[PDB]
């Protein structure tokens, strides 16, 4: 939080391996997190900024499918500009697209 303090406001540790890609959705408030364990998660955030209040964050659901190869899982991901669709890549020479 660039307005609260230098240190992170909150930290997550549910990931079982190194986190490789984290990006913000261009339109929606959701942000995705992926790691080498082949697990992808998406969190909703209360981006409200009309008042001096911290944003509330909630998990949505777990995602998987990027089998770990050579200990490497999800390599990179990117959010769709306008809809809650996520593109993911992995070490298995395969990429997966997730939709509602």
């Amino acid at each position: 939080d660039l307005d609260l303090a230098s240190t992170p406001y909150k930290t997550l540790r549910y990931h079982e391996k190194a986190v490789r890609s984290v990006n913000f959705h261009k339109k929606l408030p959701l942000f995705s997190s992926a790691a080498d364990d082949g697990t992808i998660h998406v969190f909703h955030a209360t981006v409200y900024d009309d008042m001096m209040k911290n944003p509330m964050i909630v998990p949505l659901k777990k995602l998987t499918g990027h089998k770990v190869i050579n200990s490497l899982g999800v390599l990179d991901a990117i959010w769709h500009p306008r809809e809650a669709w996520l593109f993911s890549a992995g070490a298995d020479n395969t990429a997966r697209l997730w939709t509602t």
């Binding site: 939080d1 307005d3 609260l4 303090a5 001096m52």
Partner: protein, 63 residues
């Protein structure tokens, strides 16, 4: 006394016993700048956004 540049950090101190607001003038074109200090912490429509949002449990005197 520290170079705090965070607004919510200052608000936490205010919400944590009287503040003060300082007004200064400078040119780069001429421009106005203001400071907010509490008991030392001194933060650098920012003035309105800060003052109007101040909790009623605090007293602030200009200059």
């Amino acid at each position: 006394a520290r170079e705090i540049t965070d607004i919510k950090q200052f608000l936490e101190l205010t919400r944590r016993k009287t503040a003060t607001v300082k007004i200064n003038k400078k040119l780069n074109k001429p421009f106005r700048q203001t400071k907010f200090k509490v008991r030392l912490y001194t933060l650098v429509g920012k003035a309105k956004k800060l003052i109007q949002s101040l909790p009623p449990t605090l007293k602030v005197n200009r200059l």
